[model samples]
Target: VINYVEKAVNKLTLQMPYQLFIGGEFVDAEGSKTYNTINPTDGSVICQVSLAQVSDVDKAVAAAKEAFENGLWGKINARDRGRLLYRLADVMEQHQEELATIEALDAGAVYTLALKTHVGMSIQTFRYFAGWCDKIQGATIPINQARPNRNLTLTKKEPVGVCGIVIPWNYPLMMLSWKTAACLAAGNTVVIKPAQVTPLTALKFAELTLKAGIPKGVVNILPGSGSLVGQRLSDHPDVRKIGFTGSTEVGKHIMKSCALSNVKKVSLELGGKSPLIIFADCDLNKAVQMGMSSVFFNKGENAIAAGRLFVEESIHNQFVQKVVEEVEKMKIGNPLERDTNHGPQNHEAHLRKLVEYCQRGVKEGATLVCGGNQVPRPGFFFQPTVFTDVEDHMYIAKEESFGPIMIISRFADGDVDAVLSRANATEFGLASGVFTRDINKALYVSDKLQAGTVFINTYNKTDVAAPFGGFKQSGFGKDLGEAALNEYLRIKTVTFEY
Candidate 1:
């Protein structure tokens, strides 16, 4: 079933560079240490890549700082910067298939979806920010002081130099584009630490940057563990900002590291236990399809993967039944296959975690509707598990599984206030969704939902023009839209006495 994976690996291994990208060149680790990045499909070693240490992080940061201060990156014409980004996007579009293959093989993303969202969205992200490179500007503020135009106050937006971006493993290329695109558009240089397990796409992207004619030292890639590369990036004095996407625990740690070191700006798109509320008045068929995608897309290895699903009591049973039928209809197999919709988890540890999460669901009295065990196969594959009658206080209900397990809870019909209260009860407020045909109800619930991004009659409909972030412990700062560019820029005020 996975022979195609071997063939794809043979084609890519020769092309994929197994080294760190520092100052626009690929090099081995300082200690010459290497680690194997495994393929999640069949538990086989993809290839060995260099393991970056603290010294490597220092080199990468210094290179980025040099680029920001004296190199072609920060001092270039604004429109020229936009052109460079546009060129990069074009280069990526030219090699979209290769990138999608890398994501499918390394990240276990289904090939079709990976091609569309993982790689396709990344290409669009760069083009979107490319148009903004020259448009990022500040404003002239009107001073409240009683001066007849004697004092002029102007605010200038300047790049936060030498940003440190630590991206998560799930959406390797997409997360990179989300942070790096805006950072570059704002005229900032970056030292990126791609997640260790899935660093191939970042390395491949580095190769493309050179092909795209981006100047040397503007972008750097370091592949290593979070405790070292991530911590060093956070603690480095030269790093003006830190953009991170990962678990909430790691996000908090990075935030503390930034504070304890240089007080660098930190923007985090952390973990989300997003809730999807299905009202009884919603389009039933659309609700099931969107809700299934909301939770099961990316094999539930998503930050906003609808951790808690609240179905109104009137339609709860019908929704679950429809969802189960769809789940069974999904094609689960090798990610490299064109027809496979459900692939293996990203790694073995996460698969084990999902199994344990299912166990807790059953132990806590939630009825296991279907699929609570690993697929009786070789790879790290888990059945698309579903749990019904899940109580609010259950362990599985509160914590983020980050897997293919869906926890479905029931809410009383017409009790919008009660369900809204329960929805906002979590420490996370990243993303939420509501399905209804009534505009008034949608607006009321959307206003009440405490998440950063809310979906009406849909789920996971994030756009490049719309800001994406969280409200509370899910962390602050935007990813997509115009708001994200500001995260990488600083405002300086100039007051002139005329």
Candidate 2:
């Protein structure tokens, strides 16, 4: 049954002969290089995308630079910029099904959820940023007596110039819109590098951008490997700002590259091993359901996956047992099927990494209560795992596995402060959540947590209006809401003599 569903979805949704998008047109690369993006479920090639080399990146950067400095896109009024984005949002809503299908096939996300939620979020992000385009403002400062006679100062915001955006594979379309919409709405031309594993939807988005009447060269999509294309974008001198979403290791490389050339303004949203804590007084059933959804949602491939679960010592044993049972009953099969609660990992390498982490947990004296083993299937599927008796220092607890593996640890009765400190000790501080009924405890933990986002009594809830980003090593700058648009514009002060 799962096989039938996969085949039917693949046949119905597949598009072919994808090309690199630049200067408002889809064209072949300068070189004859091509790379095939394969379906992680079956290891079959979905589509052949142009492999953008350094030369291709140069072309994209040149186009973006030209658009920013000399093209109609830069000369357009701010209101017109907002209008274009609004039109783009309309187009995206019209083709949400197509975008959702492409995203599911390319990223191996569940079809229904990807279409209804992820694609919807992308459209909303564009529309949200569109609303902010003409509303960007600056402040006027009151002058001291020394400057009163001079009729003192004021400031305004302007576009930061050509922006280079590098999106990750996990949530391709949404992540692209998160950065691109805000940057373009602020009047900056964009050169985008989509993750090689899932560049299909991004390529389609480029076409849609052109169709929506955005001027030529305003947005360019370069589809290729990270080593060649991503590096080139990071090192390009013409790109004034750089935005990235991916692993912390790669983000570091991008930062280093940006520092080398142009010293471009950079915004990075990187990795996390976010914790979801449950207090003894909290509702168990509600916590269990939300906890499962928190970690295993998207098959645990999220940057902010709840890798650690800190249960109060009194209920630690019972909570772990219930969680393990819940995980054991979850169906793991084809993502397109409605019955399957979890799907395969994005690729074979990621699957192997999860397996290694699980094995290391067992070797290091952690008890694997439910699933620490891979499924004996053709696809890259692993069982939703639960591990208990885990030390805080274990690699499985400290590092991000990016798969459906949860580590359960206990906190003693008077050790609330110690547990919170342990949770905040990790270098990655993207998102964290606490499950507790006590308002004061929630408030105290919320204030103390070092993450960019903290959820209470629930997990993984996001909105188009709320700003989302990270603290510490998780990277900087926010996405969504008005705060996101602020990163793309520059503030300028103006004064006039009366």
Candidate 3:
């Protein structure tokens, strides 16, 4: 076991140097500004990353623009572009262990979870988009006979040119590939900005892209704060499209900036206060377990945390008891440990914010049935919390805490329609789940829910081929599948006379 652990640690530490990647090359920042990435598990410095500014954004954009407009990358055939993406996926598979390790070390994700799941999903995303390369087709429209002599009309899809991708700290590599793979497969040049908190894997991804023989200037990785690099990318005139995954507030800022500047195409995957409904007829044991994992998974930082729990009145008390008991038995320790289930919060500030929200819940007259305090440790850690007797109007019920806090609310019997109405009450429509043995009930409830992705009997299950995005304030434009690639392309119609 010790040998295996050492090997795993070694895999992440190898071939990594703290640096920024621009124009497919490792280079220092122009301003000499730098910041340290902290290990959320121990509150120690993982490594230093250069603080990129508008100047660096300009350089990266220039590289991508040149590649899209003049370089061979611009003229590569669709099938060849697909081949390159497949090769890139192959390289990612070869370095899967290393990539997972880097993600675990930098983001405080468990090693096994990162390797077997997160990184695996990323590889699958690349391969899935790669398969769509040759399949991207546009329809031909028949011309009207009114224009007698000779009229021809047809439409074709072309690359949108120079895409800007800005990802959040959580699930760094997975999110990067989620956006970048489809963009590249659609024949667009890319400039990616990884979240400053966990940027190691992204920088390494740049190295791997070059090693895979992906042309230089085709992909560039820029690591920096959102204020500097992120803002620039959103507003840059040369960037034809922008893909962003982060908070709703910041997402709004990005949309506004893009509208004011370039009117560039924007795709946003933003915040969620999702609901997981449990009916009285549902299996209590299975529902409780799924509920606990839904909110606590990824230390509750997931956008689709299932933070809201709607339970039927008949089973509300029993379900709450079981969940509290289950959460108590979870092992909380270092993420690197195999047996540890709950890791530290992403950072100290996040930990404090979660605790503060818990306190507010208590003050607002909600009963804390289970964990609701900080753990004594060198790193930033918070105990898994569950609140009951929560009113619909309380902050815990309405606001997005982005932590492991679950709010349990009750509804009367034969009120499935009313419950569904309440569940869809939030401004967010990202993801929601329903638990029921009756297929008809599940279908009815799912159809009424106002989320983009709805789970029938599960929570947080995602596939690369499926379309993922949200409605209302959860933001616009879909990610993943063929729809995502279309976002990176522009439609054109050609007319001719003979």
Summing lDDT over every window of 10 consecutive residues in candidate 2, give the lowest-scoring window. Answer: 1-10
TM-score of predicted structure 3: 0.96
- Candidates 1 and 3 compared: the better one by TM-score is 1
lDDT of 2 by residue, 1-498 (tens): 001112245347443327878888787788667888877767788767788878888988899889999998888898988999999999989878777777777788887778877799999988988898888888888765454456668898989998988888878888898889989989899999888888888987887886699989899999888778778888887888888888888989999999988899999998898988889989999999998998899888888779899999999988877877888788877777778767777877888898899889999899888777778887677888888888888888888888888888989975778999999989989999999999999999899988999999989898888899999999999988888887898999887666
lDDT of 1 at 318: 94
Best by lDDT: 1
Residue 14 displacement in candidate 2 (angstroms): 4.7
The residue pairs in collision within model 1 are none
Q: After superposition, how far is residue 233 of candidate 2 from its true place, in Å?
A: 1.5
Give the alpha-carbon lDDT of every model.
0.89, 0.84, 0.84
lDDT of 1 by residue, 1-498 (tens): 001113345256426767889988898898799899888999999888889999999999999999888998877799999999999999999989888888887899998888899999999999999999888889998877556547779999888899999988888999999999999999999999899889989998998999999999999999988779999999999999999999888998989999999899999888888999999999999999998899888999988889999999999999999999999999899997768889999999888888888888898899998998989888799898888998888898789999988889999999999999999999999999999998999999999999998999888898898999997899999999999988998889998877
Clash tally for model 1: 0
Q: Which stretches of candidate 1 lie over 4 Å from their true place?
A: 1-14, 144-149
Query: How well does candidate 1 score on lDDT at residue 464?
Result: 91
